[PDB]
Amino acid sequence: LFRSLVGTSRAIQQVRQMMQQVADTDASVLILGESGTGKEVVARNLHYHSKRREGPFVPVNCGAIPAELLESELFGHEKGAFTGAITSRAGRFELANGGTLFLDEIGDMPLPMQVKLLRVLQERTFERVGSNKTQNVDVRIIAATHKNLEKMIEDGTFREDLYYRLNVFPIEMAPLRERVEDIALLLNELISRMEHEKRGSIRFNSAAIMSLCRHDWPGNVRELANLVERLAIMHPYGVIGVGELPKKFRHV
């Protein structure tokens, strides 16, 4: 259902503490961090330690949904509202009612939908597309982005008013290269997962871990997880020394 946030670093301890405060509340959470830094972990963790911990956790990827269809995605539609509406559709909001709604990559939401998202977050009502029946929403909002929202406000690509509405309780996730002291602990967690799930086993020697601690991690912890995965295929139940690392991971 949820994962815990492994790590010994100051920054990761800050996150844990900030998670305890806000989870129980219904404050809107905005999580800032590079891709793979554990933003969805924090979000799903928040939820199950929240007033809505029995209700629905509803993802919405505001960027991977075609702009023309995002309104129908969020509120739903009845029929005839547009070409192809053969049937009725519940939206994310509907499906999230009584739970948390997770707005994944909020910085990719089109401006038209930013406006409508704000009106709903204010009025707490919405119209399905086509229908003019307004409808009540009960949702705990959690949003995540890796974009600089402040710059986007300046560029006129993100709305100031939405921003201040969503950014009530900001949580910043450090990128992996800024918490390399967490790598060993993260490696252990990632390997237990793999073993618990009967996918395989490995472990890393000290030289390897030193080498990994010097890596960039553009893909951060997800990249880390992928590497564990590849090495378990390549050296099942092996020990990984620096010679078992792929070249781009060696830094001696």
Residues 117-156 binding its own copies (CB under 8 A) are: 119, 130, 132-133, 135-136, 138, 148, 151, 155-156
- Please give the backbone phi and psi of residue 170, each rounded to the nearest 5 degrees, phi first: -70, 125
Shortest Cβ 183–its own copies spacing (Å) = 15
Identify the residue among 33, 91, 107, 130 touching ligand ADP (CB under 6 A). Answer: 33
d(CA 142, CA 27): 9
Is residue 83 exposed (0-12), middle (13-18) or buried (19+ Cβ within 10 Å)? exposed
Query: Could you report how far apart the first and last alpha carbons of the chain are, in Å?
Result: 39
Report how many residues bind ligand ADP under the rule CB under 6 A.
Answer: 17
The site partner of 86 among its own copies, ligand ADP, none (C-beta below 5 to 8 Å per kind) is its own copies
Instruction: Name residues whose C-beta falls within 8 Å of residue 111's C-beta, 6 or more positions apart in sequence.
Output: 157, 158, 159
- Confirm or reject binding of residue 115 to ligand ADP (CB under 6 A): no
Site track 94-113 with its own copies (rule: CB under 8 A), x = hit: ----x------------xx-
Shortest Cβ 192–its own copies spacing (Å) = 18
Shortest Cβ 22–its own copies spacing (Å) = 6
CA distances from 81 to 86, 94, 113, 123 (A): 9, 18, 17, 23
d(CA 62, CA 103): 7
- Confirm or reject binding of residue 45 to its own copies (CB under 8 A): no
Shortest Cβ 40–ligand ADP spacing (Å) = 4
**Region from 41-49, 201-209, 222-230, 237-245 binding its own copies, contact rule CB under 8 A:** 222-230
Taking alpha carbons only, the member of 244, 219, 210, 215 closest to residue 230 is 244
Residues 170-199 binding ligand ADP (CB under 6 A) are: 186, 189
Q: Which residues bind its own copies (CB under 8 A)?
A: 21-22, 25, 27, 34-36, 54, 59, 61, 63-66, 80-84, 86-87, 98, 111-112, 114-115, 119, 130, 132-133, 135-136, 138, 148, 151, 155-156, 159-161, 164-165, 167-170, 177, 216, 219, 222-223, 225-226, 229-230, 233-234, 247-248, 251
Name the binding residues: 1, 6, 36-41, 45-48, 189-200, 222
